[PDB]
Every structure is written in C-alpha cells, then in structure tokens.
C-alpha cells in the first residue's frame, strides 16, 4: 500500500533511442511493458555463454543478441537480453544490474524492443558511440577512445 512500493532499480532511465519511430510517449509505453534489456559495458570478448549463465539467475532467457561493429561485424561491448516474462527482467534489473559479468561492472536498461539494425554500434567508427570519446583506458574495449 504505502511507499514500501519503492522500486528504484526498475524505474526508467534517462536514455532514449533517438532512432525509435514513435513519440517519447510510444517509446515509454514500450519500455514499461518490456521484457528485453539493454546490457552495457561488456568487454569485446564477453561471450553469449557467460551472459546466459549470469542473466539466467533471474529467470529464463528467450534470446540474447550480441552488439556488433556495424562494419567489422565483431563484438561491440553491449547486448540485448530478452526474457519470457517482465517479472524476470525486473529482477535482473534489481539484482544483476551494477554487478560483475566477466570481471567487469555492467549496467542494464529497459529497452523498447529489438528490431533489425539495433545490434550495430552507431559509433562513427563502427563500434559504440560511447567509445568514440572515451578518455579512459579499457583493455576490454580496445584501449583508449577512438579519438586517441
């Protein structure tokens, strides 16, 4: 009944897919009813096998789509995990988000839904945009940012 309802880990993030079609209203309606998650900060060598093992801890996974370099077609450092039920996705959001996957801290976000073309880095150079300007060194994402 009261504020015990607090579920901060399940709340919508600030991210919004700029290539989505509908309003921000249509993207938000999908996000609050989604069963698919965006997973960020993976290493380029984190496998689908590892993702399956960690994310299955919160419920049965239906499909996993690895993010790829649009032009090189190699692991990009992100992925989409889709559950059969939202209750299971919420729990991944609640207890898996912010923990270690293949030795690195990952972050999950609700996703409107997979669609052909969502698996490619939108990064100017092919990988993820995030990596174009990174000013930190990351041996799991190819060293320094692209502008370096």
């Amino acid at each position: 009944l009261k504020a015990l309802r607090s579920d901060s880990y399940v709340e919508l993030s600030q991210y919004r897919d700029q290539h989505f079609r509908g309003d921000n209203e249509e993207q938000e309606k999908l996000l609050k009813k989604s069963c698919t998650l965006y997973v960020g900060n993976l290493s380029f060598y984190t496998t689908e096998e590892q993702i399956y093992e960690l994310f299955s801890k919160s419920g049965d996974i239906k499909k996993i789509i690895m993010g790829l370099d649009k032009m090189k077609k190699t692991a990009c450092g992100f992925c989409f995990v889709e559950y059969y039920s939202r209750a299971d996705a919420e729990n991944a959001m609640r207890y898996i988000n912010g923990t270690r996957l293949d030795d690195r801290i990952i972050r999950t976000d609700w996703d409107a839904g997979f669609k052909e073309g969502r698996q490619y880095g939108r990064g100017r150079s092919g990988g993820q945009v995030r990596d174009e300007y990174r000013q930190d060194y990351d041996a799991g994402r190819g060293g320094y940012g692209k502008l370096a």
Partner: protein, 732 residues
Amino acid sequence: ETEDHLESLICKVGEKSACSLESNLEGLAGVLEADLPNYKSKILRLLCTVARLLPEKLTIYTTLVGLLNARNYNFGGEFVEAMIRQLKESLKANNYNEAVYLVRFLSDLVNCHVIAAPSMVAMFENFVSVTQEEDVPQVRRDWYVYAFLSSLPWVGKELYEKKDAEMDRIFANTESYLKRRQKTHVPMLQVWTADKPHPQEEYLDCLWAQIQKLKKDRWQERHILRPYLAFDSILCEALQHNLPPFTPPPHTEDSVYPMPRVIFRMFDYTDDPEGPVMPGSHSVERFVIEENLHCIIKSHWKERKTCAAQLVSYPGKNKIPLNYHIVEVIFAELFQLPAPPHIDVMYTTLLIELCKLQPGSLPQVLAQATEMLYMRLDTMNTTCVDRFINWFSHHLSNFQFRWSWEDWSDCLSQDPESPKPKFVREVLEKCMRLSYHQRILDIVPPTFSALCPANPTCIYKYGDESSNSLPGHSVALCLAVAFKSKATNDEIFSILKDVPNFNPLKIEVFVQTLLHLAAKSFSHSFSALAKFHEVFKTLAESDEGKLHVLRVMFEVWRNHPQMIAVLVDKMIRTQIVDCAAVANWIFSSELSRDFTRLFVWEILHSTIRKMNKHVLKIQKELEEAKEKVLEEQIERLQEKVESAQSEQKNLFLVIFQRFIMILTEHLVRCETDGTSVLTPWYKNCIERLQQIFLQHHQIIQQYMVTLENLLFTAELDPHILAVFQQFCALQA
C-alpha cells in the same frame, strides 16, 4: 496534499530521525489529533496499514496509538475496532503471516494502556482453544499457538500481572498440545541432520523453550525497544478498551495455513569471542532480533542498497553482534526449506551491498561463515548445497574469484563422492560457466587441479574419427557437406533416405552432424535447431525418437553441461522433445554416471517449471476468455487446459515411478548384500526425491488420491514412504 503529508509523517517517526524519537512521537501525536476532525478515516487507515506492513516498527507505532488514545479515548476505540476488522479479513483470506503482525500489534498495545490487559488474555485463551477443535489440520492448531507465543515477548510480562490462573491453564493446554504434535516434517525441513554443533529445532519447540527462559526470568527481556516506556506519565491515566469476544474463523476446505518451520542456527557467542556477547539460541532476544531482521528484508527486498542500510542501522536496545545476526539471517533465508522467501540471486547482491557498507567488518564475518558452512557440509541437505554452490560461485565472480583454496585441502584426499570434494568440483564448474575454463585452472592451487572442470569441447562421432567402421558414417559425411552448403530440409531428408535401420541410425548421424557444425556458439546451435526443425519433428516423431535425440545430444556434449541444458530447454520450447522424454532421459542408464551432478537436476527442474508455467498460462487465458467466436475459443481453451494438466500429472507420475524404481533397487540390493544403505549415491538420490516434493508441493497436492493409494503405498520400503509422509505433514 494533506493526505500525502500525513502518510509522510506517519513514516518519519519510524525512520531514523535527527532528534530523539520520543520527541517526534510527542509532536506527531498532537499533529494527528489536531487533524482528527477532518482526517479521521485516513489516519485510521494509515495506522492500520503500518501495523500490518511495518512489524519491525511495532513498538514505535503502538506507542503512537497510545499517546493518541491518551488524548481521545473514542479514537483508540475506533482504531482497535478497525484492527479487529482488519484482522478478521487477513484470517479469512489465508494471509496468516500478516495476521500475526496484527495479533502482535494488539498485544503490545496493552503495554501502551490502550487495551485491557485482561481483554487480551480472553482472546488468547480462545486461540489456544483451537487445539481442541476436532478434525482440523495441525498446521491450523499450530498457527494460533505461534500467534500466541510469539506475542509474549511483548505482552507476556504485563499479561502475567493478571489472569495468571488462566494464564497458567493456557500454558497447560499448550504444553499438552506441544507434546502431542507429530514431527514427521522435521527431517525434510532441516538444513543439517547433525545435532552438533547446533541442533536445527522445530519452530514451535524452539519458541516454547524460548518463552520458558523468559517466564522463568520473570518475563524480563532486554532487547525489544519500548518508547511507550518514557511516556508513563501520560499513558498512565489513559483509558484502556476491551477487544470484543474473538471467535477464530472455522476451518474450511478453502483454508491454507503456513507450513511448519525449522530454525536455522549456525552461530553462538563463541564464534565472536571479541564482540558483544551474542544472545543465546533459546533467548527471546535471538527470536526478536532475527524476526525484525527478516521483516526488514521483507520490507526492502526490491531495493538492495536501501535494504543493507536498514539492516546495518538496525536499532538494538542493548549492543549485539549485529554483523553476525545479519549474515545468519540471510543464510537462514537462502537455505530455507522448502523455499526462500525471495528470489535466490537477491541474497547474493544483498550481501555484496552489505560488504560495501561495512568494508571493515562484514567481509571477515562472511568469510568466517563460508568456512563454517564448508566444514559442516557432510550433513547439509542436497537442496541447500545446490544453493550454497550457486551462491558462492556467483559471489566469487564478483571478487575476481579470490579465495584461500588451501584452507579446504582436506577435500583433496577424500572419496571424490564425499560432500566436500564434490562441493568444490561443482563450485569450480560454476565458476567456469561465469567465465572460462583456463581462468579457473589459474585461480586454484596446483593441488586442486584434479577437481577443476573438464574443457567443454564438442565430441563428434563421425568426425576426425578416421574410425569409419561406424554405421551411417558416409551418410554423416554427406550431411556435413550439405550443411556447410546451405542445404535445405528436403535435401537433408534425401541424404537421410540412404540410411539403413523410428530410425535410430538416422537420428544419430543427423544430430551428431548438425550439432558439430554449430559447436562454436549457443546462437548457432539454436538457429541450427530452428532451420532444420522440420527434420527433427520427423525423425523424433515418437518418444523413442525424442529419447534417442536426447541420448545422442548428450553423447555429443557430455563435456559441456551448460550447452546440454540450453539445448534441452530450447528443444522443449520448440517441441522437438517433451518433458516426459526429458524425465525418462534423466533416469536413463546413459546418465547413471552423471546422475548426482548438479546440471542433471537443474535441467529436470527447468523442465518441470516450463510445464507448470505452461499450465498456468493456458488456465489464465481460459480465465480471461471466460470473463467475456468467443465461445469456440473457450471450448478450445478448455481442451487445452485438460491436456496441459494431464501431461503435467503424467510428468510427476513418471518422475515418482522412476524414483521408486531406482531407490527400491538400491534398498533391495543392499538388504541382500548386507551393505550400507547410506551411500553418497543414496544421499543424493533420496534427497533429490524429497526436493521434487519441496519445489512443487502445491501442484503435487492435486494428486493425493493417486499418490496416497496408488504409488507411495505400504508395500513400499519405509525409507521411500518416509519421504511421502514428510510431504503430507507439510499441510497436515
């Protein structure tokens, strides 16, 4: 607005203030009275809510209902009116755990001069009276006693100032009742069967023993904070009320009562020599401390960070080894049989959040507990061990797999089947699946290498065999060629038409080949199954076919358990095989050597859940469709429910028949060769049967007629029956 502000303030008092609690209760007291004219209903609602949802705050709010009753008799009378109504509802709806918090809130009100001390006694006398009730489940007679005893830590002291006459005659009927209860369920609920170091006691016996130490101590406990203690000046002259005659609701066929429990215990004051003395196992302080901690987790389970914080800041009247209580209570929940209150992975990250909050003291205790758990492994229940493995391996992966493995060197020279070495082997296997083979070989010492997991490599039969005397060999070679060429189903069918014998040989060459050419990733094998899905549905149109697929797939991937699991799952969901076949596969002779490994059961339970989920889904659809062409559907949804439930019952039927068959075979052989019945194999097998009951007792209940009269009958060995009878005692 205002509505909003009230709820905000009602919560503020319970929360950690920045000005003595008594002050806030003083203030909010008036504020609420001032608003009674206009906001009587809301404040009456808000309080009845915090009463059943914030037990860990029990005494902070009872006080409040007191200061108020000390400024508006008629108000208190209304609150107490709601509470009873609110309590009658929770009871009729089978929400007994919520009731206890109500029944306990009333109790403590007596200490706040709001309810007539004698009044409470009259109700409890009626609770215990349930023990006399004829032809009612023991779990029912149990709940009322528990509701009664669990209150005494709060009411008992003053409830002893009066009606000692009946407040002795109640203990009398209790004692009598407590000694007449059957305890058939204990063996099935204990985390450990060893009596040492710590006995795992039935929950009512443990509480009974707890009340005693309190009574014989003149009902003077030293933990339960009582704010209504610093307000005697006011509460004194307050006018108490009288709870109406409470007649417990009649046991109906729709009643469902909490299952009995066993108290998890792993710590004692000697486990923390240099720390505030830990309340003993039979002290009410222990009960109350774990109760509040359990309730805190229940209130914040969805937010891990808030949760750790509410735990770590727990307010204890007198200092206690908090960190130890927090770890003990979390493991108490993870290892609770039949099931934990919350999703398993929650405890893992909850513990992580606690380690980040008390970097300087929590980790050592958590490291101490891990050590202790490992050393007591020999008698831990299989279902808990699994839980232990998954927790520890997942935990390690968040701390770079850093652990002092040599501390567990003793396992190295034990039968590989013993609980300790097996536990290490399984933990390591799990660590590999969260990373990779080589990484794990690198974390453990050279001496442990033997327990490391095998490299998860594919095993092609007609592969670089060069051993071609095998049937269908060439046929397989054509398949390999076709697949790599983007062949079509019909083409593959053609290649298969050249196979000499449901055709076992066709299956084997197809599977062996299809899997080998998709052995690079899970996603390849999946699409592989999806593309040539039609072939599968053909070769395995029969149960023998279904069973043979599973047999060849296992032959191919026996070194990669995680692959086997995801494939079986995918096969069931795409109907290439069904649960019955998976069940027969699990008990097949081809798996006899891997029968006690975790992945075997992880698969069987994942198959059972898919069946259950499926049943539930169709039932709901019918439910919705029934709540409205629209007919032709309900005709169809009915048929689907039928089949779904029928196939579900059959799955449990086969699983049980198989268990009975292999357990009897063992029991007989032993009782003939005069050999020990208690072998490692037996332990896993008997405890795996028990687990079937634990995980799905709800569904299984629907088969009582068949189970009680057709399968688990008297001609069965008592060792097997025992498991059944324990199960029945859960709702007896």
